[PDB]
């Protein structure tokens, strides 16, 4: 037993009121469980929000408030701003065991405008070719919302092998970046002519190519 | 203000031993309670150790009891964690923790450290990265904002740290996450500079890999 | 200008309770109370159900003038001490509170009465210790369960301890719930327990006109 469950993700807009919950599998959540709320800012930046179920940490803005909703714990954000966009973790202290952490809730403030990605394709370098290896690098940056689809084409033929695409990631300005790599030998790099990288984002498709 | 930073990142093989440290500052370290919390690759959080303000009362979870030994040196303001008999499933980012008890009840886990990564799996050897550059080549002059790059191929273990121009280049550096090429990680990062700029002056790539004690620099030649 | 007292490291409550290092607030008088945001607890972990209400009485009263009284406690061991509340490393306790424990597996039912016929109001701050296990309860106070029942002529309050394991503070899971009882002139107080009583060592003097206030600032005047 002793499994803490909280929402997988929640979405909201600036100015609205949102409530994050935290349920205990062992039964009801009680003041004696001492609900703790932690916020994860990207790049592994953690900051404690609420302790003792309701006591608000020193630096926390007053718009945050934690309380008990029925048999659950709850973190209420009253007047959410875009800087509330982060992952919020829960912690319940079970006498028996100790602190056990929930899956965490990822909160998304819907705000930023639709962004088109700036695609760029880079060839393999001479230093790498000196090792008889080659890796094209297609860099997708500055797009929103966060979903892209990458297809490679070598000399008209699409590539279904040796292509390595990364998961979308947040940026500093809340936009997104992504990347994909195509690795082949130096002999096969000379054995073909046209290489292109196609980013299909919101239907509209952007490609960058060389020769 | 109150500030904690972990150190000791490295690759260990299963069954070995590794010791973590936490340099504390911004408060009288000997008056406060400390704990260790980790984050598996599955982004789950898990508490692993607790030690009193005087080290008299120490407690662990069943997952690491008997294997982990926590300690502190109140005279140096340093929190330690001696890990041994390591298993694959211990791989996580290890965080320094501390709380804040003031208004009535306290706030556990208020103030976290930057976290230092520990990779339990010994599947591969600590392999430093080869730093290959990324240049346009097709000088298209599309707009003034030309994009440079830097490839950090086949490194192990995590992490690498790319920084441009020894810290001068900070505007939109865009460091992408790594991938798993065969057994090793490859990573890249791209900085955008004006078209008038790249003919004029040099942009250099600074790749630091702590776990293999390598800090390679790579000048981008067109 | 005004007469401001700086708590520095002792907060308003720890000064009233007398946690280690808080001796400098004894006998202190003020109009405004500087509660530093940097304060820390330095004794046994506790909790005050109405922390904001009790903190208000101490700040508004305007003085920490403690007055001693001798309770002839029965057969319980007095002057208990724990290693989470060390003063000069002496295992110690609140210098205003008295922790009572059984002597030779004998914690008797107590019944003491203290009367105020004077010209000031008295502030009795007492507590209820919550052991972590029923074996810890028995090793300290023989009888199980515990009982505390402090009464006046108009107020009868009864506290039943909550045994259990709480988060570790100073490496300890037990707790002490601190309450207060105000005895106006003509009224009296009756301590009555079979266990878990964190008995008081006296009372603080209350002003009939309370003009002081509290503050939570950054520097001295
Ligand atoms: C015996 C005593 O009075 N001192 C306390 C003891 O009761 C208990 O709190 C101990 C940890 O079990 O710390 C100290």
């Amino acid at each position: 037993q002793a499994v803490v469950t909280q929402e997988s993700a929640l979405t909201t807009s600036p100015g609205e009121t949102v409530t994050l919950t935290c349920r205990s599998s062992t039964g009801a959540v009680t003041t004696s469980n001492y609900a703790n709320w932690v916020q994860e800012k990207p790049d592994h930046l953690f900051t404690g929000l609420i302790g003792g179920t309701n006591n608000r940490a020193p630096g926390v803005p007053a718009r945050f408030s934690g309380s008990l909703i029925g048999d659950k714990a709850a973190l209420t954000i009253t007047g959410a701003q875009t800087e509330d966009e982060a992952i919020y973790f829960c912690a319940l202290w079970y006498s028996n065991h100790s602190w056990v952490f929930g899956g965490g809730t990822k909160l998304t403030v819907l705000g930023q405008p639709k962004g088109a990605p700036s695609v760029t394709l880079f060839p393999p370098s001479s230093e790498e070719l000196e090792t008889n290896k080659a890796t094209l690098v297609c860099t997708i940056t500055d797009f929103y919302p966060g979903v892209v689809t990458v297809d490679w084409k070598v000399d008209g033929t699409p590539v279904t092998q040796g292509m390595e695409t990364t998961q979308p990631s947040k940026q500093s300005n809340n936009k997104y970046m992504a990347s994909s790599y195509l690795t082949l030998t130096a002999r096969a790099w000379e054995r073909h002519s046209s290489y292109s990288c196609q980013v299909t984002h919101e239907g509209h498709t952007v490609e960058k190519s060389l020769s | 203000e109150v500030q904690l930073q972990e150190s000791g990142e490295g690759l260990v093989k299963p069954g070995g031993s590794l010791k973590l440290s936490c340099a504390a500052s911004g408060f009288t370290f000997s008056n406060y309670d400390m704990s260790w919390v980790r984050q598996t690759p599955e982004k789950r959080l898990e508490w692993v150790a607790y030690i009193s303000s005087g080290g008299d009362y120490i407690y662990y979870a069943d997952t690491v009891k008997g294997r982990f030994t926590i300690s502190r040196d109140n005279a140096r303001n340093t929190l330690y964690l001696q890990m041994s008999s390591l298993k694959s499933e211990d791989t996580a980012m290890y965080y320094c923790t501390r709380n804040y008890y003031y208004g009535s009840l306290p706030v556990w886990f208020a103030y976290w450290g930057q976290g230092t990564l520990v990779t339990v799996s010994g599947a591969a050897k600590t392999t430093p990265p080869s730093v290959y550059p990324l240049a346009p080549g097709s000088a298209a002059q599309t707009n003034s904002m030309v994009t440079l790059g830097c490839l950090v191929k086949g490194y192990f273990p995590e992490p690498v740290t790319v920084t441009w121009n020894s810290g001068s280049l900070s505007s939109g550096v865009h460091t992408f996450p790594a991938v798993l090429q065969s057994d090793l990680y490859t990573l890249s990062s791209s900085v955008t500079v004006p078209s008038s700029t790249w003919p004029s002056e040099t942009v250099t790539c600074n790749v630091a890999h702590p776990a293999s004690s390598t800090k390679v620099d790579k000048k981008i030649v067109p | 200008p005004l007469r401001l007292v700086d708590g520095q490291t002792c907060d308003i409550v720890n000064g009233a309770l007398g946690s280690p290092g808080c001796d400098h607030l004894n006998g202190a008088e003020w109009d405004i109370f500087i509660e530093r945001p940097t304060a820390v607890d330095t004794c046994y972990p506790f909790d005050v159900p109405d922390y904001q209400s009790l903190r208000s009485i101490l700040a508004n009263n305007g003085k920490f003038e403690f007055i001693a009284e001798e309770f002839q406690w029965s057969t319980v061991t007095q002057n208990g001490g724990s290693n989470a509340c060390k003063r000069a490393n002496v295992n110690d306790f609140f210098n205003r509170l008295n922790w009572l424990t059984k002597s030779g597996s004998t914690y008797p039912l107590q019944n003491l009465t203290k009367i105020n016929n004077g010209d000031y109001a008295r502030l009795y701050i007492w507590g209820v210790h919550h052991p972590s296990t029923d074996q810890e309860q028995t090793n300290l106070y023989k009888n199980n369960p515990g009982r505390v029942t402090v009464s006046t002529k108009t107020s009868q309050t009864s506290v039943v301890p909550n045994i259990g394991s709480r988060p570790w503070v100073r490496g300890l899971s037990s707790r002490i719930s601190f309450y207060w009882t105000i005895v106006e002139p003509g009224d009296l107080i009756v301590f009555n327990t079979i266990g878990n009583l964190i008995a008081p060592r006296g009372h603080y003097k209350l002003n009939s006109q309370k003009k002081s206030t509290i503050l939570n600032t950054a520097v001295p005047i």
Side-chain angles (χ1 to χ4, degrees), chain A, chain B residues 2-222, chain C residues 1-89 91-221:
Chain A
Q1 198 60 9
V3 166
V4 166
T5 37
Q6 43 174 157
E7 306 92 345
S8 42
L10 251 66
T11 167
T12 186
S13 35
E16 307 285 329
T17 304
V18 195
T19 310
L20 316 183
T21 69
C22 181
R23 196 221 59 173
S24 189
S25 61
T26 205
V29 179
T30 285
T31 281
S32 301
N33 279 345
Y34 303 110
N36 265 243
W37 284 97
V38 198
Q39 163 189 92
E40 175 174 0
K41 278 309 185 89
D43 272 357
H44 322 86
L45 301 184
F46 280 80
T47 296
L49 257 50
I50 287 191
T53 323
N54 34 36
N55 266 83
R56 171 155 40 257
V60 182
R63 65 174 181 274
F64 287 81
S65 56
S67 54
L68 229 53
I69 289 190
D71 63 314
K72 320 176 182 180
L75 162 65
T76 293
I77 317 170
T78 326
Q81 300 289 346
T82 80
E83 60 264 12
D84 298 352
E85 173 179 309
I87 309 177
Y88 297 80
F89 281 77
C90 189
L92 291 213
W93 160 278
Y94 291 86
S95 302
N96 318 63
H97 315 48
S98 274
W99 299 97
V100 296
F101 285 89
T105 288
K106 157 72 180 183
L107 181 66
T108 325
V109 156
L110 291 204
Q112 312 107 51
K114 189 265 223 188
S118 299
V119 190
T120 322
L121 172 59
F122 297 98
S125 49
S126 39
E127 297 109 319
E128 186 181 354
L129 293 172
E130 293 175 329
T131 51
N132 302 111
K133 247 183 173 297
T135 306
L136 282 297
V137 177
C138 194
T139 72
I140 322 171
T141 55
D142 289 316
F143 71 88
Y144 186 89
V147 49
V148 291
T149 297
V150 180
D151 305 327
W152 284 76
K153 301 215 324 295
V154 162
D155 293 1
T157 51
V159 198
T160 60
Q161 48 146 59
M163 89 202 175
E164 199 75 283
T165 313
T166 80
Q167 210 83 73
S169 310
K170 214 77 188 186
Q171 296 184 161
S172 48
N173 49 30
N174 289 276
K175 302 170 187 177
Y176 280 88
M177 64 177 81
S179 195
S180 194
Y181 314 112
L182 174 73
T183 316
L184 41 73
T185 48
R187 51 162 88 267
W189 155 257
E190 312 178 342
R191 238 182 44 205
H192 298 299
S193 174
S194 151
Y195 311 91
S196 63
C197 156
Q198 307 183 109
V199 181
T200 298
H201 177 53
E202 278 299 89
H204 208 38
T205 300
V206 182
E207 95 168 315
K208 286 306 190 62
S209 38
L210 40 75
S211 99
Chain B
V2 196
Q3 215 276 351
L4 297 176
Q5 285 174 343
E6 296 82 358
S7 46
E9 51 188 353
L11 169 73
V12 192
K13 32 178 190 175
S17 68
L18 186 69
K19 188 175 175 178
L20 302 172
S21 291
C22 178
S25 56
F27 62 101
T28 63
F29 177 84
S30 36
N31 290 335
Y32 274 99
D33 309 327
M34 295 306 241
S35 324
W36 286 98
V37 194
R38 59 177 186 191
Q39 179 171 68
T40 79
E42 279 77 27
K43 297 307 167 194
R44 244 212 98 324
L45 289 180
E46 200 169 9
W47 164 93
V48 303
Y50 172 83
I51 186 167
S52 83
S53 65
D56 188 5
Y57 302 99
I58 55 98
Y59 297 102
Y60 319 102
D62 282 6
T63 74
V64 303
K65 183 188 286 175
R67 302 195 290 117
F68 283 11
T69 298
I70 185 172
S71 60
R72 57 197 300 177
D73 191 351
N74 286 332
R76 294 183 68 247
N77 308 9
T78 321
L79 182 61
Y80 301 109
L81 171 60
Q82 174 72 24
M83 306 184 303
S84 50
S85 309
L86 283 175
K87 334 172 160 293
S88 271
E89 31 266 30
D90 282 351
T91 297
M93 181 105 57
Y94 280 76
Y95 293 89
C96 207
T97 68
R98 191 252 170 168
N99 347 250
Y100 160 44
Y101 333 71
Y102 176 64
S104 331
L105 289 47
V107 179
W108 272 91
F109 307 138
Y111 306 120
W112 288 66
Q114 266 320 119
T116 195
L117 180 59
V118 165
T119 329
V120 42
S121 156
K125 193 88 66 173
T126 305
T127 49
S130 37
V131 181
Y132 306 129
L134 295 182
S138 303
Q141 288 182 104
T142 294
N143 190 246
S144 99
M145 303 291 279
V146 69
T147 309
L148 279 308
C150 190
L151 201 51
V152 201
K153 215 223 269 204
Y155 69 79
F156 197 95
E158 289 263 57
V160 296
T161 306
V162 171
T163 302
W164 294 104
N165 246 24
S166 312
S168 284
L169 250 176
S170 36
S171 41
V173 154
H174 301 279
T175 292
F176 305 92
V179 290
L180 189 65
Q181 160 71 52
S182 64
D183 253 8
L184 320 179
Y185 300 95
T186 76
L187 177 144
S188 48
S189 165
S190 98
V191 72
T192 302
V193 290
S195 266
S196 321
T197 314
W198 187 26
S200 318
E201 42 96 348
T202 315
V203 165
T204 38
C205 181
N206 318 115
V207 171
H209 187 220
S212 62
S213 302
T214 52
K215 177 151 61 178
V216 184
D217 281 353
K218 224 62 161 53
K219 173 223 187 77
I220 177 59
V221 279
Chain C
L2 297 184
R3 188 167 33 164
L4 317 175
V5 152
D6 186 341
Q8 296 174 36
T9 54
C10 297
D11 43 308
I12 182 53
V13 174
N14 278 279
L17 303 180
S19 304
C22 300
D23 311 321
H24 68 284
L25 302 170
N26 175 67
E29 290 203 357
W30 73 86
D31 299 316
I32 304 301
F33 190 109
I34 306 339
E35 199 163 80
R36 302 294 180 197
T38 58
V40 290
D41 309 331
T42 37
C43 182
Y44 212 93
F46 68 92
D47 64 332
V48 190
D50 284 348
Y51 183 88
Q52 210 51 233
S53 301
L54 178 68
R55 173 173 172 265
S56 205
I57 304 182
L58 304 169
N60 189 18
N61 186 38
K63 67 185 183 190
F64 273 138
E65 193 176 351
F66 189 56
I67 293 302
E69 278 181 289
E70 193 215 9
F71 301 59
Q72 331 268 340
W73 287 132
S74 232
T75 45
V76 325
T77 273
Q78 290 188 358
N79 291 259
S82 195
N83 81 341
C85 186
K86 296 162 167 304
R87 187 204 318 252
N89 192 80
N91 275 7
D92 181 359
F93 208 68
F94 310 95
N95 52 31
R96 318 289 208 203
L97 282 312
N98 181 21
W99 189 356
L100 300 185
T101 37
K102 67 184 202 183
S103 73
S105 173
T106 187
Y107 205 80
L109 179 273
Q110 309 267 345
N111 181 42
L112 268 66
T113 304
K114 286 295 171 183
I115 287 178
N116 182 356
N117 288 329
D119 59 335
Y120 62 78
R122 303 179 182 184
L123 184 49
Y124 289 106
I125 305 178
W126 49 275
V128 177
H129 181 238
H130 303 293
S132 207
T133 54
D134 310 294
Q135 293 85 359
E136 196 197 34
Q137 153 75 21
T138 46
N139 295 323
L140 294 177
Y141 332 104
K142 169 198 182 68
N143 319 305
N144 190 303
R147 183 188 75 71
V148 163
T149 310
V150 187
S151 36
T152 74
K153 293 207 272 189
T154 69
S155 68
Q156 165 90 335
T157 297
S158 314
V159 185
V160 200
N162 300 326
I163 282 181
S165 188
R166 283 80 165 191
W168 292 291
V169 184
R170 254 86 67 177
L172 277 159
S173 193
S174 62
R175 290 291 193 274
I176 296 172
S177 266
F178 280 136
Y179 306 75
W180 70 99
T181 297
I182 302 183
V183 176
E184 292 283 346
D187 214 350
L188 82 183
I189 194 174
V190 177
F191 306 107
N192 200 259
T193 176
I194 85 162
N196 304 64
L197 175 64
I198 308 295
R201 301 202 191 268
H203 65 265
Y204 288 73
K205 292 223 299 177
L206 281 192
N207 294 312
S208 294
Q209 169 169 353
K210 302 171 183 59
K211 280 220 65 76
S212 305
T213 198
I214 194 181
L215 208 42
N216 175 97
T217 54
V219 277
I221 181 167

